[PDB]
Amino acid sequence: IWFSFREISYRHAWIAPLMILIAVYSAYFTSGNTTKTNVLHRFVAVSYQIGDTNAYGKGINDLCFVFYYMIFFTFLREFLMDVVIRPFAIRLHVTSKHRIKRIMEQMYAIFYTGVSGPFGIYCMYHSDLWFFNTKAMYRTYPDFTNPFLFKVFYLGQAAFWAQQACILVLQLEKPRKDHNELTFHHIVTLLLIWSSYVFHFTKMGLPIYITMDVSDFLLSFSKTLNYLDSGLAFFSFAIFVVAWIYLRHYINLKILWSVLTQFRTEGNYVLNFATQQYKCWISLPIVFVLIGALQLVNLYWLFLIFRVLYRILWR
Amino acid sequence: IWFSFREISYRHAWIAPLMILIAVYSAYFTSGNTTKTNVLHRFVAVSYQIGDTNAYGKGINDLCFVFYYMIFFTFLREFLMDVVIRPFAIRLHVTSKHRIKRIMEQMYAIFYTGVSGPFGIYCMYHSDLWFFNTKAMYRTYPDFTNPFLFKVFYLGQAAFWAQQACILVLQLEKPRKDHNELTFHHIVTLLLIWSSYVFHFTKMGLPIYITMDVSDFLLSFSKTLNYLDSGLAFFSFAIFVVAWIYLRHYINLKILWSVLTQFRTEGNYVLNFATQQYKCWISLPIVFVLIGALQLVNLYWLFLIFRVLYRILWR
Amino acid sequence: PKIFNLFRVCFISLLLIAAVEYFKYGTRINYEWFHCTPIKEPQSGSVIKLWARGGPSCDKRGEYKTIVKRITRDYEPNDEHLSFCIIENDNVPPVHYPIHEDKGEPGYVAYVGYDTDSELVQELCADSTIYHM
Amino acid sequence: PKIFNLFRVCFISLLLIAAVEYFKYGTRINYEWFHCTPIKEPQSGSVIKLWARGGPSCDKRGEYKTIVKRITRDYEPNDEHLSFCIIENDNVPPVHYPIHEDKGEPGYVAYVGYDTDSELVQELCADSTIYHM
Numbered sequence: 001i002w003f004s005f006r007e008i009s010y011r012h013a014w015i016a017p018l019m020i021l022i023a024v025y026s027a028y029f030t031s032g033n034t035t036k037t038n039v040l041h042r043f044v045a046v047s048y049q050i051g052d053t054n055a056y057g058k059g060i061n062d063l064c065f066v067f068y069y070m071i072f073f074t075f076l077r078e079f080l081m082d083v084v085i086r087p088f089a090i091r092l093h094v095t096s097k098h099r100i101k102r103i104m105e106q107m108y109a110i111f112y113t114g115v116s117g118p119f120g121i122y123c124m125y126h127s128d129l130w131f132f133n134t135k136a137m138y139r140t141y142p143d144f145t146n147p148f149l150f151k152v153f154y155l156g157q158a159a160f161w162a163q164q165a166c167i168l169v170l171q172l173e174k175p176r177k178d179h180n181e182l183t184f185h186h187i188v189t190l191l192l193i194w195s196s197y198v199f200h201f202t203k204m205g206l207p208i209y210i211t212m213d214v215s216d217f218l219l220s221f222s223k224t225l226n227y228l229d230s231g232l233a234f235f236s237f238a239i240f241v242v243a244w245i246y247l248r249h250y251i252n253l254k255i256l257w258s259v260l261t262q263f264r265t266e267g268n269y270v271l272n273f274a275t276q277q278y279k280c281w282i283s284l285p286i287v288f289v290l291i292g293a294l295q296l297v298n299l300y301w302l303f304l305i306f307r308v309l310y311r312i313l314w315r
Numbered sequence: 316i317w318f319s320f321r322e323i324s325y326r327h328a329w330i331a332p333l334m335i336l337i338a339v340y341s342a343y344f345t346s347g348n349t350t351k352t353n354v355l356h357r358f359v360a361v362s363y364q365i366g367d368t369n370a371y372g373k374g375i376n377d378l379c380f381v382f383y384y385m386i387f388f389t390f391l392r393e394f395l396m397d398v399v400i401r402p403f404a405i406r407l408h409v410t411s412k413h414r415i416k417r418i419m420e421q422m423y424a425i426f427y428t429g430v431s432g433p434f435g436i437y438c439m440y441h442s443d444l445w446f447f448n449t450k451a452m453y454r455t456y457p458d459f460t461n462p463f464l465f466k467v468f469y470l471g472q473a474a475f476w477a478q479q480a481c482i483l484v485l486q487l488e489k490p491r492k493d494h495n496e497l498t499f500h501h502i503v504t505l506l507l508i509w510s511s512y513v514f515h516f517t518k519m520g521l522p523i524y525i526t527m528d529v530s531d532f533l534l535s536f537s538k539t540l541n542y543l544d545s546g547l548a549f550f551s552f553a554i555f556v557v558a559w560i561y562l563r564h565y566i567n568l569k570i571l572w573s574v575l576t577q578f579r580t581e582g583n584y585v586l587n588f589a590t591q592q593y594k595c596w597i598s599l600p601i602v603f604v605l606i607g608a609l610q611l612v613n614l615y616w617l618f619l620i621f622r623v624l625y626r627i628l629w630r
Numbered sequence: 631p632k633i634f635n636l637f638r639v640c641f642i643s644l645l646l647i648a649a650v651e652y653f654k655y656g657t658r659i660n661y662e663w664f665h666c667t668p669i670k671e672p673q674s675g676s677v678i679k680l681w682a683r684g685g686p687s688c689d690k691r692g693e694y695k696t697i698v699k700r701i702t703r704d705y706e707p708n709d710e711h712l713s714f715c716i717i718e719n720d721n722v723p724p725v726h727y728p729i730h731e732d733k734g735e736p737g738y739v740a741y742v743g744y745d746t747d748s749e750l751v752q753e754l755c756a757d758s759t760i761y762h763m
Numbered sequence: 764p765k766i767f768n769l770f771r772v773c774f775i776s777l778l779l780i781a782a783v784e785y786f787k788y789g790t791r792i793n794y795e796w797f798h799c800t801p802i803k804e805p806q807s808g809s810v811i812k813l814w815a816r817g818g819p820s821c822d823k824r825g826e827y828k829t830i831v832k833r834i835t836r837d838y839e840p841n842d843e844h845l846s847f848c849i850i851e852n853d854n855v856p857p858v859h860y861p862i863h864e865d866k867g868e869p870g871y872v873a874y875v876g877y878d879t880d881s882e883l884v885q886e887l888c889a890d891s892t893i894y895h896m
């Protein structure tokens with residue numbers, strides 16, 4: 001069955017990750033203790049529940065969970081893409097190579113972001129961060145524990161972006177696409193996620209997930225409407241550019257100004273290595289540099305968007 | 316003078332190290348304080364004198380001294396070799412390429428070993444190690460301090476062998492010579508010297524310097540007498556083989572047996588990381604393995620010597 | 631003239647030298663980790679009893695270092711304030727342990743608890759001074 | 764399919780993760796190195812006076828750790844046996860230092876000497892217990 005498996009793994013790239021996921025889930029669920037006393041629980045579920053409240057700690061089972069759901073997102077990407085989009089993008093009159101590949105990619109992005117954007121907004125709705133309040137982003141800083149949904153959202157985003165990065169590294173496509181700053185952006189994204197989790201800055205990182213996700217959703221929807229040659233694509237592009245300007249630039253300059261102003265004024269600002277209080281004069285430059293790098297990369301894309309608007313308004 | 320310097324450094328390779336040595340010595344001696352308060356003293360002289368007695372400590376000025384005298388031995392090798400041996404090996408009727416190169420190398424080895432062998436025997440004469448006594452080799456183990464002559468001898472041997480190794484690495488000759496185990500031997504030699512000094516096993520290392528040096532002297536003298544086609548070379552070879560057997564194999568099996576027996580019986584044998592007492596059950600295998608590796612390499616050469624004796628006794 | 635091979639081998643050799651010197655220095659200043667093993671003994675509630683036991687290399691200095699390290703690493707004074715005493719065996723030389731596993735009484739013991747039960751530490755350290763932390 | 768590039772980048776990333784976690788753990792268990800600076804004060808002969816001074820993060824635990832580390836690292840009980848006492852300021856909270864450089868009195872002081880002058884330590888620690896090491 002060596003040749004059959006080779007052919008299936010060539011055609012369907014999701015069969016191996018599906019087998020891994022199926023095996024792990026069957027082994028975990030066809031058993032007795034499904035609680036933290038199982039060895040597969042550190043992969044299937046989030047660990048370090050503080051007592052029996054709704055607040056989870058951090059550890060190495062976080063790495064195990066992130067790795068297992070990297071495998072899960074690798075399965076989901078290929079399976080969903082093929083099995084669903086193939087039929088959808090073929091029963092729709094799109095006849096090309098570049099058009100089919102990019103409609104593939106943007107419809108998958110639409111699905112994932114439609115799932116993860118409202119999820120993040122719901123997580124930010126059930127906290128004091130409601131509506132990008134930047135003070136609740138610093139008041140109770142050390143934040144060693146996160147709620148259930150907040151932690152699973154955070155770590156699912158980490159697993160998804162880690163899988164994107166490893167796909168970017170383990171190439172399976174012509175790399176040359178004329179947009180390289182994407183590698184730097186992916187590096188900055190993983191650094192932000194990981195340092196945000198490790199150094200207890202997760203309440204600070206949630207608004208950025210929300211703002212990047214909603215912009216990604218609108219941009220992917222507009223590019224799909226472009227691909228289908230609909231004529232309704234310009235309205236969607238205008239909605240996208242307004243929402244991009246607001247949600248990325250206004251909100252992220254608000255967050256960068258919040259760093260400079262209320263990093264030093266809200267909560268604890270005296271360094272304590274014993275209490276793991278890292279909010280101090282030392283980490284302020286690090287936080288500002290990382291978010292400023294992200295915002296410069298976003299400003300570049302704003303320049304590109306304005307360039308395209310220019311072309312559209314004289315051509 | 317760029318071309319003149321290039322030509323001189325091509326012809327005479329010792330001019331650059333001579334300039335370095337001359338500069339450092341002139342700067343050190345054309346000054347005021349020639350004692351430990353000078354910055355050049357850590358290069359020119361051995362440091363860490365304990366008070367005003369005859370016993371020196373260890374530190375990083377040991378590394379500085381070793382490096383500066385690596386430069387010194389690099390100068391001495393080339394200058395002595397060229398200026399002296401050229402005239403001597405040319406006024407002697409040796410007409411070849413292989414003959415001239417090897418008579419070069421063996422006469423330099425004769426000079427260096429004639430200097431360093433009696434030196435080591437004199438160092439071992441003014442201690443209790445006299446005549447390869449193996450108990451004084453362990454009684455006062457921790458040995459943080461060494462006498463003046465003992466330290467300068469030890470570190471000069473270290474500098475000479477380090478320079479030999481770096482010449483072996485930075486190749487300037489056809490490497491292929493049909494004797495490669497020499498690289499492994501040089502690795503073992505530097506490991507032995509460095510670990511012997513660092514872990515306070517210098518009284519244990521001095522007999523090996525003596526035994527290897529005298530054997531090197533006799534072997535180089537016999538090979539030179541061979542090169543000159545003298546006819547007296549066989550007597551020298553017999554003297555060399557007897558002295559090799561005794562001084563290397565008998566004495567070094569005595570030292571290896573001394574490890575196994577009196578490593579555990581003489582002096583302190585209870586490990587103490589606070590008092591830097593490393594003579595214990597843990598370091599016994601390390602010491603035995605290093606000296607056994609050295610003795611296996613020597614046994615190989617004994618096989619070669621017996622092979623040559625065989626050829627000489629049926630041909 | 632493989633200058634880069636010489637540079638790499640010298641670089642590696644210097645890292646070997648520095649690693650071994652750091653090994654010596656670190657095992658000399660942190661020797662009680664190798665020679666002394668902490669022995670805890672819960673008494674009642676939050677309080678425990680500390681001492682260390684090893685060979686002849688576990689001297690009184692090593693026992694004191696091990697005990698204070700356990701006190702300051704197993705109790706969090708930011709969560710709750712603790713209380714402890716250090717009691718010395720004055721019928722004992724600084725170096726008193728043997729090689730074999732029959733070692734007698736330690737040179738130092740300590741009783742450590744939280745301020746939620748400080749009366750137990752007070753009545754468990756007879757008349758030794760009690761340190762707050 | 765550059766599998767080796769993926770392996771190398773994952774390997775490097777895991778070393779980054781482990782290095783940062785070790786940084787957190789080590790700075791948490793060895794926090795008094797960053798927040799407390801030892802202040803020595805020679806008294807007469809071999810004896811000195813120890814205390815530590817920092818900001819609010821130099822608590823009583825940090826002062827005690829700094830003092831005992833200085834005692835056990837600046838004196839060699841193998842060469843000569845030493846003697847010391849730890850004196851606590853009980854008119855002081857565990858967290859008592861301010862940010863600015865006007866900090867008052869420490870939470871802990873110590874007098875440390877060798878047994879060659881043990882009478883000076885005995886008369887310099889008024890009625891505090893004296894530990895031998």
Ligand SMILES: CCCCCCCCCCCCCCCCCCCCCCCCCC(=O)N[C@@H](C)[C@@H](O)C[C@H](O)CCCC[C@@H](O)C[C@H](C)C[C@H](OC(=O)C[C@@H](CC(=O)O)C(=O)O)[C@H](OC(=O)C[C@@H](CC(=O)O)C(=O)O)[C@H](C)CCCC
Nearest residue numbers: 189192195196199201205208212234237278283304305308
């Ligand atoms: C004391 C010491 C202690 C130390 C302490 C230290 C502690 C450390 C500090 C603690 C740290 C705390 C930190 C807290 C933060 C926590 C963060 C957590 C996580 C957050 C990160 C999340 C990461 C998400 C980021 C992302 O998501 N990042 C991603 C989002 C990011 O990577 C991806 C971005 O979304 C990329 C966006 C690019 C946009 C452009 O692309 C648009 C182009 C220009 C136009 C368009 O697109 C094309 O151009 C099509 C091209 C495609 C192409 O460009 O190739 C094509 O044709 O195929 C098309 O334009 C045309 O085509 C017009 C055409 C016709 C016309 O107009 O007439 C013409 O003109 O030609 C239009 C639509 C046609 C419409 C006609 C109406």
Ligand SMILES: CCCCCCCCCCCCCCCCCCCCCCCCCC(=O)N[C@@H](C)[C@@H](O)C[C@H](O)CCCC[C@@H](O)C[C@H](C)C[C@H](OC(=O)C[C@@H](CC(=O)O)C(=O)O)[C@H](OC(=O)C[C@@H](CC(=O)O)C(=O)O)[C@H](C)CCCC
Nearest residue numbers: 504507510511514516520523527549552593598619620623
């Ligand atoms: C609790 C935890 C704590 C942990 C604690 C841990 C602490 C660590 C442990 C602490 C450690 C303590 C350790 C203490 C030790 C301290 C040590 C300090 C330093 C000591 C090291 C010093 C290093 C010196 C080593 C050296 O010096 N090492 C060096 C010495 C070593 O590297 C070099 C050796 O000396 C190499 C010797 C090789 C010998 C052969 O070579 C000989 C050949 C076979 C014969 C001859 O040589 C030739 O063969 C000539 C060939 C040359 C050729 O072979 O190429 C040619 O023709 O050109 C020729 O043979 C013929 O030619 C005969 C010919 C005619 C005939 O017979 O009829 C024939 O038959 O063909 C004869 C003479 C012709 C005579 C005719 C009578």
